[PDB]
Amino acid sequence: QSLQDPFLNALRRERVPASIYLVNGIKLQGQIESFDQFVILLKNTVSQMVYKHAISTVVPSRPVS
Template sequence: MSRIEDDVQTSFLNDLLGDREIVWIFLVNGIKLTGYLEAFDQYVVSLQSPTGTQAVFKSAISTVCRPHTTPNKTTDERSSTVRIERPARRHVAISR
């Protein structure tokens, strides 16, 4: 990892550490962890969750972010979409 990338990562994690807000950590296998960032070093992030403290290897982390929500659009706010009818599928028998 280059020095510039390390500075960006360290700065971001320090901000999350100082804020003491809940964070989401998404792992490369798709699992989402939720908790408070307690500490981090070059290889590991320590996450405090209701089930206890978890040490998560940085190599297993895909994304770290603050929790967020997306507003649900009502029917009136959705853009109108044009529905395109597809032609019926033809089944072709293949002889061998």
């Protein structure tokens, strides 16, 4: 089955800073606030909506259980 939900849920739960590298190289830094089938909400100065199809990677700022 799926493993994307637990990976993002581990970061959202533990409040660990995360880097979302987009398909064009731009690195979004913030906190996973929520996510659904198609988007993730990244939080910093404001809460923005990132489309999953335009993400290449999601890197945790530190190892996560």
